């Protein structure tokens, strides 16, 4: 939960899950940026955020 | 067995140790089963 | 509670609150008085360091409910042998704190 | 009464949960309750003993408090708690020991020891953890007159009495017709015998029956029926009803027919089973009646003619056997059961310290004579002493 | 189903933990559970009974809440809780009794009374407090189809069969060689008899064997084995196989030789015991086969020399015996025992309200006829009714 | 050792109480304990097994925590909990299986397997929830030198040994007088026989004495006493003392006279009873002595003169005896009982995986052989194996 | 050889003199010796057995450090000391059992078991202690 993530300020589980490159799922409200370039599609830039 | 099951005070026990006839008879007349059985066995002993 | 004022002598081994505890049979205030009577610093040791800490019951904020209930019990009490305005002010201040 | 149970349960819980490495959020309530208990018991003298050989042992309470705010109860906590745990263990053991040897023809439920009578006051009534065991719940329900109940496994409900009945007899003791039975504890063994196989009787069938009352009512009782005899089949040399001489008994087992068992309640029959063997179920009764008959076979083989002559001199004799065992049942009043360890505890506390023979109990908990004369005063005192015994049993195994 | 057990456990804790004077710290979770239960149950309507002798009872749930203050409970709080506790107890008892007397041929696991079916809705799931008893845990683990397990104290698995067989027979009934056995509850008492004293048989050894199939598979069975049988050891008069007359049986006990006890499973000899007595353990078994041999005494003294003449006229017979008793058992399916009393309560309510007999249960809820043909549907019905009985026994003792 | 018990308790509580829909207020402690134990278990790879058919398996723990945001648990949270609970169940089962099989002569209290030794590290002591079962408490009290106990129903202490003693004997076995007794399970059948009916002995009364010593001190025991003979009251053939000849035994039953029972500790008279029948209680004993008399009635009848002639040729011999049962007992050491599942569990574990026999255990864990020569080292190993067996059985019922 | 005796003597002294209540001055040398032994033995592994029916066992040393500044040791210090004292006792028992059953024709004075060969290295010689035996 992103709500809990912001509320409690903890980052332990998420950091360890992401560092070891393991599947994760986040549920919560997020603004989106629309990119419609196939250059961005081929050159992976959807995970560097 | 008498001191374990039945209740004996200290003076009563002291008199029973001396085998005084009075305390023994007063206990006998109270229909105590163990001592009556003991006396019955002792009577049965004298069979010549 | 319509009882004589507590004649007392300074320096007794027992605090006056103990005498209050063993003289009032109104369950709410008696229980609250007992809790205050035996409320003392708890001697604990943490990581080789000596400390004095409060009891758990007050720590979570629960004794305030007991105090409020006792005060509300005192609010509607008869309060005999007391003048009018003094009693009214006393019970209204008690209601204010409750 | 219940304050002693609270003391025992709190002490056991403290001995259980208070170990190394535990999280305080898991034992916080127990620690707080223990602190409140030691707070309450502080500053109150106690005297116990003075009857029989029990040494008078005073008791005082000047002890410290246990802290609250920790993340793991370190060795300091357990080491400090062990001393007061031992002291309270000894105190409650002595108090309950004193309680368990007091009786009274009146007020048979109220406390009858100085410690217990002092504890039943209201200032000590701040400490009552819960009522988890069956006996404390039954006591509290009896305090408010509700529908109670005790669970048992083969209780000792029947007194020992090896009595026998004769119907047709003579001082010669050569042609008899009667019954024997042996009711020991939870087992009932009833056997009926004929010395003639009803050859002289009408319709070649002779009637047998037996009636046994119950000292107290029983509900939801499990009974098993086995059509045989295990104690009345071997040859037996027993005495007469007047002890003049002895009589011979050499039986042969024959399968009984018309085996009818009725469970009867207050002059009314509730459960009636005919020839159904195995496990049976009855729900409400206060007396047990069994009926059965012996039937001479219509045709015979030579050996039967050997062992069953028409003439008066009989060598072999006939009988039938039944077995009635009560495995599990529920009663209203407390029953002295050998499934638990209560009667053993009361006998141990009695015989260990030589208590005077009270005017309300039989001498030395003779359960046979005790149950032969069950009385409401006796049942109240027995319930109280057994409850205190079970309270004691949770601390000193 | 689980909601019913949650209600039972919550009610028991409420009635046996809320006593005047107790600290709030030991009842916080219970207070929250009670408040949730009342705030969820209020406003509904329930109907129950209407079948047989149970009148249609209508229940309305409308009660207040419980205050979160008064750190120490007073008697007024106790009585306010007690009123709702009594009402809930009555409702639960009546619902359980209504459910206990309804059966179906298929899908016996699912409830049948309208009360439980309504309680299995979605919004009532909020009260699913906990699961601690054996039956509730086993039910909830069976719902996920995992390994099942029960513990029994001397169960009753063997169906009643007082059957006998004759290997060698003649219409004269004076020359027999066979075996007799009894299957009564947890007791197996087999015996092998001979009239010829094995003089005719080669090697002077008369082979005896017997097979008893169990209707269900047991695990971790402790078996007490004794070399002597105390049933077929007395003179008896027995009807013939087909039945036209009565033959005689005069036994003498001899020491069994080369006693072999094997526990099998689907044709595999798993556990073996040779010439051993006392106690044995079978890890997993479903069939029992026993073998023992009658041995003619190679040497004789005058008395036994005259006991067995070398010719056909036989005045005495020879017989060996064995005794097998199941001490404790663990089974994958529900059963009826001699310690637990759930079957007793089921039969008690059954005969209290005299509900008509369904085609899935033999009359009277008898155990022998039920175990004669143990079907999976009857097994599921037994499991459901026993779980409901265990739920009931936690409330009304 | 208590670490494994704490882990098992936490796992069972998590698998039971954590169900779909329970309010969060009832699982705070459980969730905290689960989070702490899963935090501690991280970063510790484990290897299990290594002896016997049990395969060597590897373990590694990397699992996330459980959130504390939801107010009521949903299905997804329940399933996520189940996923880890199942793996921990498998781990604890493997650890228990590895621990049970192994044994040693020294350090019978210290662990033997690798997993238990590794759990004894300091960082792993941070997991401990409660010690509520009787076995873990007895283990702790034995660790810290305190008096312990177990409530055992029908315990086996008397090894199976059918022995007899003859005081009067003949090479032709035509005139004998002696005693026969059996010690099986929790049953004591002792009987004394005379082939002359006490006609030549002084005072026309024959004395019988028999002492049966136990292998472990008992306390607080209730005993059922019946003046009967069961296994020595039927036509029986018995081998000789030298194992060369056989004789004929044909008994009859009278009433034993002056039946006295003694209970002794280290040969000290603690309690006694005279002629009492039904049930008695003894509080401390280790040797049971049976003394009684056989008496000839003074007056006879026509049916008695056949049995007891004054001459040498006898046809029917007299015998009396008693049956003694230990229904309940409490011991300071671990024993085999009827009301638990310890011996079955350990024997099943040993026999299913074909584990070779060690130096301190008999072939196949024969209980009789163990109880014949009970030793303190075997006592300690039995304590350890019983504790781990109970822990394992608390998981898979 | 001497290192094993040093370990045994240090274990004896630790298990004897570490009891709650004693002043810290009585165990200063014991504390220093034990701390040096723990900090030097850590980060290491050993293997023992490999002959007969003795338990072929692998051992790893990664224990922590004991406290140093305490006026009077409480039960926590004693417990955390014993939790490693028992482990060291078991290790010494295993090493001695593996050493005793071995034999050789040549150079019997010198160590033979592989564990004793490894423990004879100079880096462990800091665990040396008194030789009053």
CSV table of N, CA and C in Angstrom, one decimal, chain G:
chain,number,residue,atom,x,y,z
G,1,UNK,N,49.0,-29.1,20.4
G,1,UNK,CA,48.6,-29.8,21.6
G,1,UNK,C,48.3,-28.9,22.8
G,2,UNK,N,49.2,-27.9,23.0
G,2,UNK,CA,49.1,-27.0,24.1
G,2,UNK,C,47.8,-26.1,23.9
G,3,UNK,N,47.5,-25.8,22.7
G,3,UNK,CA,46.3,-25.0,22.4
G,3,UNK,C,45.0,-25.6,22.9
G,4,UNK,N,44.9,-27.0,22.7
G,4,UNK,CA,43.7,-27.7,23.3
G,4,UNK,C,43.7,-27.6,24.8
G,5,UNK,N,44.8,-27.7,25.5
G,5,UNK,CA,44.8,-27.6,26.9
G,5,UNK,C,44.4,-26.2,27.3
G,6,UNK,N,44.9,-25.2,26.6
G,6,UNK,CA,44.6,-23.8,26.9
G,6,UNK,C,43.1,-23.6,26.7
G,7,UNK,N,42.5,-24.2,25.7
G,7,UNK,CA,41.0,-24.1,25.5
G,7,UNK,C,40.3,-24.7,26.7
G,8,UNK,N,40.7,-25.9,27.1
G,8,UNK,CA,40.1,-26.6,28.2
G,8,UNK,C,40.2,-25.8,29.5
G,9,UNK,N,41.4,-25.3,29.8
G,9,UNK,CA,41.5,-24.5,31.0
G,9,UNK,C,40.7,-23.2,31.0
G,10,UNK,N,40.7,-22.6,29.9
G,10,UNK,CA,39.9,-21.3,29.7
G,10,UNK,C,38.4,-21.7,29.9
G,11,UNK,N,37.9,-22.8,29.3
G,11,UNK,CA,36.5,-23.1,29.5
G,11,UNK,C,36.2,-23.5,31.0
G,12,UNK,N,37.1,-24.2,31.6
G,12,UNK,CA,36.9,-24.5,33.0
G,12,UNK,C,36.8,-23.2,33.9
G,13,UNK,N,37.8,-22.3,33.7
G,13,UNK,CA,37.8,-21.1,34.5
G,13,UNK,C,36.5,-20.3,34.2
G,14,UNK,N,36.1,-20.2,32.9
G,14,UNK,CA,34.9,-19.4,32.6
G,14,UNK,C,33.7,-20.0,33.2
G,15,UNK,N,33.4,-21.3,33.0
G,15,UNK,CA,32.2,-22.0,33.6
G,15,UNK,C,32.3,-22.0,35.1
G,16,UNK,N,33.4,-21.9,35.7
G,16,UNK,CA,33.5,-21.8,37.2
G,16,UNK,C,33.2,-20.4,37.7
G,17,UNK,N,34.0,-19.5,37.3
G,17,UNK,CA,34.0,-18.2,38.0
G,17,UNK,C,32.9,-17.2,37.5
G,18,UNK,N,32.2,-17.6,36.4
G,18,UNK,CA,31.1,-16.7,35.9
G,18,UNK,C,29.8,-17.2,36.6
G,19,UNK,N,29.5,-16.6,37.8
G,19,UNK,CA,28.3,-16.8,38.5
G,19,UNK,C,27.8,-15.4,39.0
G,20,UNK,N,26.5,-15.2,38.9
G,20,UNK,CA,25.9,-13.9,39.3
G,20,UNK,C,26.3,-13.5,40.7
G,21,UNK,N,26.7,-12.3,40.9
G,21,UNK,CA,26.9,-11.7,42.2
G,21,UNK,C,28.4,-11.3,42.3
G,22,UNK,N,29.3,-12.0,41.7
G,22,UNK,CA,30.7,-11.7,42.0
G,22,UNK,C,31.1,-10.4,41.4
G,23,UNK,N,32.1,-9.7,42.0
G,23,UNK,CA,32.6,-8.4,41.6
G,23,UNK,C,33.3,-8.6,40.2
G,24,UNK,N,33.3,-7.6,39.4
G,24,UNK,CA,33.9,-7.7,38.1
G,24,UNK,C,35.4,-7.9,38.2
G,25,UNK,N,36.1,-7.4,39.3
G,25,UNK,CA,37.5,-7.6,39.4
G,25,UNK,C,38.0,-9.0,39.4
G,26,UNK,N,37.1,-9.9,39.8
G,26,UNK,CA,37.5,-11.3,39.9
G,26,UNK,C,37.7,-12.0,38.5
G,27,UNK,N,37.1,-11.3,37.4
G,27,UNK,CA,37.1,-12.0,36.1
G,27,UNK,C,37.8,-11.1,35.1
G,28,UNK,N,38.6,-10.2,35.5
G,28,UNK,CA,39.2,-9.3,34.5
G,28,UNK,C,40.1,-10.1,33.5
G,29,UNK,N,41.0,-10.9,34.1
G,29,UNK,CA,41.8,-11.8,33.2
G,29,UNK,C,40.9,-12.7,32.4
G,30,UNK,N,39.9,-13.3,33.1
G,30,UNK,CA,39.0,-14.2,32.4
G,30,UNK,C,38.3,-13.5,31.2
G,31,UNK,N,37.8,-12.2,31.5
G,31,UNK,CA,37.1,-11.5,30.5
G,31,UNK,C,38.1,-11.2,29.3
G,32,UNK,N,39.3,-10.8,29.6
G,32,UNK,CA,40.2,-10.5,28.5
G,32,UNK,C,40.6,-11.7,27.7
G,33,UNK,N,40.9,-12.8,28.4
G,33,UNK,CA,41.2,-14.1,27.7
G,33,UNK,C,40.0,-14.6,26.8
G,34,UNK,N,38.8,-14.6,27.4
G,34,UNK,CA,37.7,-15.0,26.7
G,34,UNK,C,37.4,-14.1,25.5
G,35,UNK,N,37.5,-12.8,25.6
G,35,UNK,CA,37.2,-11.9,24.5
G,35,UNK,C,38.2,-12.1,23.4
G,36,UNK,N,39.5,-12.3,23.7
G,36,UNK,CA,40.5,-12.5,22.7
G,36,UNK,C,40.3,-13.8,22.0
G,37,UNK,N,39.9,-14.9,22.8
G,37,UNK,CA,39.6,-16.2,22.1
G,37,UNK,C,38.5,-16.1,21.2
G,38,UNK,N,37.4,-15.4,21.6
G,38,UNK,CA,36.2,-15.3,20.7
G,38,UNK,C,36.5,-14.5,19.5
G,39,UNK,N,37.2,-13.4,19.6
G,39,UNK,CA,37.5,-12.5,18.5
G,39,UNK,C,38.5,-13.2,17.5
G,40,UNK,N,39.3,-14.1,18.0
G,40,UNK,CA,40.3,-14.8,17.2
G,40,UNK,C,39.8,-16.0,16.5
G,41,UNK,N,38.9,-16.7,17.2
G,41,UNK,CA,38.4,-18.0,16.6
G,41,UNK,C,37.2,-17.8,15.6
G,42,UNK,N,36.6,-16.6,15.6
G,42,UNK,CA,35.5,-16.3,14.7
G,42,UNK,C,36.0,-16.2,13.3
G,43,UNK,N,35.0,-16.3,12.4
G,43,UNK,CA,35.3,-16.4,10.9
G,43,UNK,C,36.0,-17.6,10.5
G,44,UNK,N,35.8,-18.7,11.2
G,44,UNK,CA,36.5,-20.0,10.9
G,44,UNK,C,35.6,-21.1,11.0
G,45,UNK,N,36.0,-22.2,10.3
G,45,UNK,CA,35.3,-23.5,10.3
G,45,UNK,C,36.2,-24.7,10.5
G,46,UNK,N,35.6,-25.8,11.0
G,46,UNK,CA,36.4,-27.0,11.3
G,46,UNK,C,35.5,-28.2,10.9
G,47,UNK,N,36.2,-29.3,10.7
G,47,UNK,CA,35.5,-30.6,10.4
G,47,UNK,C,36.2,-31.6,11.2
G,48,UNK,N,35.4,-32.5,11.9
G,48,UNK,CA,35.9,-33.5,12.8
G,48,UNK,C,35.2,-34.8,12.6
G,49,UNK,N,35.8,-35.9,12.9
G,49,UNK,CA,35.3,-37.2,12.7
G,49,UNK,C,36.0,-38.0,11.6
G,50,UNK,N,35.2,-38.4,10.6
G,50,UNK,CA,35.8,-39.0,9.4
G,50,UNK,C,36.5,-40.4,9.7
G,51,UNK,N,36.2,-41.0,10.8
G,51,UNK,CA,36.8,-42.3,11.1
G,51,UNK,C,35.9,-43.0,12.1
G,52,UNK,N,35.7,-44.3,11.9
G,52,UNK,CA,34.9,-45.1,12.7
G,52,UNK,C,33.4,-44.6,12.7
G,53,UNK,N,32.7,-44.8,13.8
G,53,UNK,CA,31.3,-44.3,13.9
G,53,UNK,C,31.2,-43.0,14.6
G,54,UNK,N,32.3,-42.3,14.8
G,54,UNK,CA,32.2,-41.0,15.4
G,54,UNK,C,31.4,-40.0,14.6
G,55,UNK,N,30.7,-39.0,15.2
G,55,UNK,CA,29.9,-38.1,14.5
G,55,UNK,C,30.7,-37.2,13.6
G,56,UNK,N,30.7,-37.4,12.3
G,56,UNK,CA,31.4,-36.5,11.4
G,56,UNK,C,30.6,-35.2,11.4
G,57,UNK,N,31.2,-34.1,12.0
G,57,UNK,CA,30.5,-32.9,12.2
G,57,UNK,C,31.3,-31.7,11.7
G,58,UNK,N,30.6,-30.7,11.2
G,58,UNK,CA,31.1,-29.5,10.7
G,58,UNK,C,30.8,-28.4,11.8
G,59,UNK,N,31.7,-27.5,12.1
G,59,UNK,CA,31.5,-26.5,13.1
G,59,UNK,C,31.9,-25.1,12.5
G,60,UNK,N,31.1,-24.1,12.7
G,60,UNK,CA,31.4,-22.7,12.3
G,60,UNK,C,31.4,-21.8,13.5
G,61,UNK,N,32.3,-20.8,13.5
G,61,UNK,CA,32.5,-19.9,14.6
G,61,UNK,C,32.1,-18.5,14.2
G,62,UNK,N,31.0,-18.0,14.6
G,62,UNK,CA,30.6,-16.6,14.3
G,62,UNK,C,29.9,-15.9,15.4
G,63,UNK,N,30.3,-16.3,16.7
G,63,UNK,CA,29.6,-15.7,17.8
G,63,UNK,C,29.9,-14.3,18.0
G,64,UNK,N,29.2,-13.6,19.0
G,64,UNK,CA,29.4,-12.2,19.2
G,64,UNK,C,30.3,-11.9,20.4
G,65,UNK,N,30.3,-10.7,20.8
G,65,UNK,CA,31.2,-10.2,21.8
G,65,UNK,C,30.5,-9.9,23.1
G,66,UNK,N,31.1,-10.3,24.2
G,66,UNK,CA,30.5,-10.1,25.5
G,66,UNK,C,30.7,-8.7,26.0
G,67,UNK,N,29.9,-8.3,26.9
G,67,UNK,CA,30.0,-7.0,27.5
G,67,UNK,C,31.3,-6.8,28.3
G,68,UNK,N,31.7,-5.6,28.5
G,68,UNK,CA,33.0,-5.3,29.2
G,68,UNK,C,32.8,-4.4,30.4
G,69,UNK,N,31.9,-3.4,30.4
G,69,UNK,CA,31.8,-2.5,31.5
G,69,UNK,C,30.5,-2.8,32.3
G,70,UNK,N,30.7,-3.5,33.4
G,70,UNK,CA,29.6,-3.8,34.3
G,70,UNK,C,30.1,-3.8,35.8
G,71,UNK,N,29.4,-3.1,36.6
G,71,UNK,CA,29.8,-3.1,38.1
G,71,UNK,C,29.6,-4.5,38.7
G,72,UNK,N,28.4,-5.1,38.4
G,72,UNK,CA,28.1,-6.4,38.9
G,72,UNK,C,27.4,-7.2,37.8
G,73,UNK,N,27.8,-8.4,37.4
G,73,UNK,CA,27.2,-9.1,36.4
G,73,UNK,C,25.8,-9.6,36.8
G,74,UNK,N,24.8,-9.4,36.0
G,74,UNK,CA,23.5,-9.9,36.2
G,74,UNK,C,23.4,-11.3,35.6
G,75,UNK,N,22.2,-11.8,35.6
G,75,UNK,CA,22.0,-13.2,35.0
G,75,UNK,C,22.0,-13.1,33.5
G,76,UNK,N,21.8,-12.0,32.9
G,76,UNK,CA,21.9,-11.9,31.4
G,76,UNK,C,23.3,-12.2,30.9
G,77,UNK,N,24.3,-11.7,31.6
G,77,UNK,CA,25.7,-12.0,31.3
G,77,UNK,C,26.0,-13.5,31.4
G,78,UNK,N,25.5,-14.1,32.5
G,78,UNK,CA,25.8,-15.5,32.8
G,78,UNK,C,25.1,-16.3,31.7
G,79,UNK,N,23.9,-16.0,31.3
G,79,UNK,CA,23.2,-16.8,30.3
G,79,UNK,C,23.9,-16.7,28.9
G,80,UNK,N,24.3,-15.4,28.5
G,80,UNK,CA,25.0,-15.3,27.2
G,80,UNK,C,26.4,-15.9,27.2
G,81,UNK,N,27.0,-16.0,28.4
G,81,UNK,CA,28.3,-16.7,28.5
G,81,UNK,C,28.0,-18.2,28.3
G,82,UNK,N,27.0,-18.8,29.0
G,82,UNK,CA,26.8,-20.2,29.0
G,82,UNK,C,26.4,-20.7,27.6
G,83,UNK,N,25.6,-19.8,26.9
G,83,UNK,CA,25.2,-20.2,25.6
G,83,UNK,C,26.3,-20.5,24.6
G,84,UNK,N,27.5,-19.9,24.8
G,84,UNK,CA,28.7,-20.3,24.1
G,84,UNK,C,29.6,-21.2,24.8
G,85,UNK,N,29.6,-21.2,26.1
G,85,UNK,CA,30.4,-22.2,26.9
G,85,UNK,C,30.0,-23.6,26.6
G,86,UNK,N,28.7,-23.9,26.5
G,86,UNK,CA,28.3,-25.2,26.1
G,86,UNK,C,28.7,-25.6,24.7
G,87,UNK,N,28.6,-24.7,23.8
G,87,UNK,CA,29.1,-25.0,22.4
G,87,UNK,C,30.6,-25.3,22.4
G,88,UNK,N,31.4,-24.5,23.1
G,88,UNK,CA,32.8,-24.8,23.2
G,88,UNK,C,33.1,-26.1,23.9
G,89,UNK,N,32.3,-26.5,24.9
G,89,UNK,CA,32.5,-27.8,25.5
G,89,UNK,C,32.2,-28.9,24.6
G,90,UNK,N,31.2,-28.8,23.8
G,90,UNK,CA,30.9,-29.8,22.8
G,90,UNK,C,32.0,-29.9,21.7
G,91,UNK,N,32.5,-28.7,21.3
G,91,UNK,CA,33.6,-28.7,20.3
G,91,UNK,C,34.8,-29.4,20.9
G,92,UNK,N,35.2,-29.1,22.1
G,92,UNK,CA,36.4,-29.8,22.7
G,92,UNK,C,36.2,-31.3,22.9
G,93,UNK,N,35.0,-31.7,23.2
G,93,UNK,CA,34.7,-33.1,23.4
G,93,UNK,C,34.8,-33.8,22.0
G,94,UNK,N,34.3,-33.2,20.9
G,94,UNK,CA,34.4,-33.8,19.6
G,94,UNK,C,35.9,-33.9,19.2
G,95,UNK,N,36.6,-32.8,19.4
G,95,UNK,CA,38.0,-32.8,19.0
G,95,UNK,C,38.8,-33.8,19.7
G,96,UNK,N,38.6,-34.0,21.1
G,96,UNK,CA,39.4,-34.9,21.8
G,96,UNK,C,39.0,-36.4,21.4
G,97,UNK,N,37.7,-36.6,21.2
G,97,UNK,CA,37.3,-37.9,20.8
G,97,UNK,C,37.9,-38.3,19.4
G,98,UNK,N,37.9,-37.3,18.5
G,98,UNK,CA,38.5,-37.6,17.2
G,98,UNK,C,40.0,-37.8,17.3
G,99,UNK,N,40.7,-37.1,18.2
G,99,UNK,CA,42.1,-37.3,18.4
G,99,UNK,C,42.5,-38.6,19.0
G,100,UNK,N,41.7,-39.1,20.0
G,100,UNK,CA,42.1,-40.2,20.8
G,100,UNK,C,42.2,-41.5,19.9
G,101,UNK,N,41.2,-41.7,19.1
G,101,UNK,CA,41.1,-42.9,18.3
G,101,UNK,C,42.1,-43.0,17.2
G,102,UNK,N,42.8,-42.0,16.9
G,102,UNK,CA,43.8,-42.0,15.8
G,102,UNK,C,45.1,-42.5,16.3
G,103,UNK,N,45.9,-43.0,15.3
G,103,UNK,CA,47.2,-43.6,15.6
G,103,UNK,C,48.1,-43.6,14.4
G,104,UNK,N,49.4,-43.7,14.6
G,104,UNK,CA,50.3,-43.7,13.5
G,104,UNK,C,51.6,-44.3,13.9
G,105,UNK,N,52.4,-44.9,13.0
G,105,UNK,CA,53.6,-45.5,13.2
G,105,UNK,C,54.8,-44.5,13.4
G,106,UNK,N,54.7,-43.4,12.7
G,106,UNK,CA,55.9,-42.5,12.7
G,106,UNK,C,55.5,-41.2,13.3
G,107,UNK,N,56.3,-40.6,14.2
G,107,UNK,CA,56.2,-39.3,14.8
G,107,UNK,C,54.9,-39.2,15.6
G,108,UNK,N,54.8,-40.0,16.6
G,108,UNK,CA,53.6,-40.0,17.5
G,108,UNK,C,53.4,-38.8,18.3
G,109,UNK,N,54.5,-38.1,18.6
G,109,UNK,CA,54.5,-36.9,19.4
G,109,UNK,C,53.7,-35.8,18.7
G,110,UNK,N,53.9,-35.7,17.4
G,110,UNK,CA,53.3,-34.6,16.6
G,110,UNK,C,51.8,-34.9,16.4
G,111,UNK,N,51.0,-33.8,16.2
G,111,UNK,CA,49.6,-34.0,16.0
G,111,UNK,C,49.3,-34.8,14.7
G,112,UNK,N,48.2,-35.5,14.8
G,112,UNK,CA,47.8,-36.4,13.7
G,112,UNK,C,46.4,-36.0,13.1
G,113,UNK,N,45.4,-35.7,13.9
G,113,UNK,CA,44.1,-35.3,13.4
G,113,UNK,C,44.1,-34.0,12.6
G,114,UNK,N,43.3,-33.9,11.6
G,114,UNK,CA,43.3,-32.7,10.7
G,114,UNK,C,42.9,-31.5,11.5
G,115,UNK,N,41.9,-31.6,12.4
G,115,UNK,CA,41.5,-30.5,13.2
G,115,UNK,C,42.7,-30.0,14.1
G,116,UNK,N,43.4,-31.0,14.7
G,116,UNK,CA,44.6,-30.6,15.5
G,116,UNK,C,45.7,-30.0,14.6
G,117,UNK,N,45.9,-30.5,13.4
G,117,UNK,CA,46.8,-29.9,12.5
G,117,UNK,C,46.5,-28.5,12.2
G,118,UNK,N,45.3,-28.2,11.9
G,118,UNK,CA,44.9,-26.8,11.6
G,118,UNK,C,45.0,-25.9,12.8
G,119,UNK,N,44.6,-26.5,14.0
G,119,UNK,CA,44.7,-25.7,15.2
G,119,UNK,C,46.1,-25.4,15.7
G,120,UNK,N,47.1,-26.1,15.2
G,120,UNK,CA,48.5,-25.9,15.5
G,120,UNK,C,49.1,-24.7,14.9
G,121,UNK,N,48.3,-24.0,14.0
G,121,UNK,CA,48.8,-22.8,13.4
G,121,UNK,C,49.2,-21.7,14.4
G,122,UNK,N,50.1,-20.8,14.0
G,122,UNK,CA,50.5,-19.8,14.9
G,122,UNK,C,49.4,-18.8,15.2
G,123,UNK,N,48.5,-18.6,14.3
G,123,UNK,CA,47.5,-17.5,14.5
G,123,UNK,C,46.6,-17.9,15.7
G,124,UNK,N,46.4,-19.1,16.0
G,124,UNK,CA,45.6,-19.5,17.2
G,124,UNK,C,46.5,-19.5,18.5
G,125,UNK,N,47.8,-19.3,18.4
G,125,UNK,CA,48.6,-19.4,19.6
G,125,UNK,C,48.4,-18.2,20.5
G,126,UNK,N,47.6,-17.2,20.1
G,126,UNK,CA,47.2,-16.1,21.0
G,126,UNK,C,46.2,-16.7,22.1
G,127,UNK,N,45.6,-17.8,21.9
G,127,UNK,CA,44.7,-18.4,22.9
G,127,UNK,C,45.5,-19.1,24.0
G,128,UNK,N,46.8,-19.1,24.0
G,128,UNK,CA,47.6,-19.8,25.0
G,128,UNK,C,47.4,-19.2,26.4
G,129,UNK,N,47.4,-20.0,27.4
G,129,UNK,CA,47.1,-19.6,28.8
G,129,UNK,C,48.1,-20.3,29.7
G,130,UNK,N,47.8,-20.3,31.0
G,130,UNK,CA,48.7,-20.8,32.0
G,130,UNK,C,48.8,-22.4,31.9
G,131,UNK,N,49.8,-22.9,32.4
G,131,UNK,CA,50.1,-24.4,32.4
G,131,UNK,C,50.3,-24.9,33.8
G,132,UNK,N,49.4,-24.6,34.7
G,132,UNK,CA,49.5,-25.1,36.0
G,132,UNK,C,49.2,-26.6,36.2
G,133,UNK,N,48.6,-27.2,35.2
G,133,UNK,CA,48.3,-28.6,35.3
G,133,UNK,C,49.6,-29.4,35.2
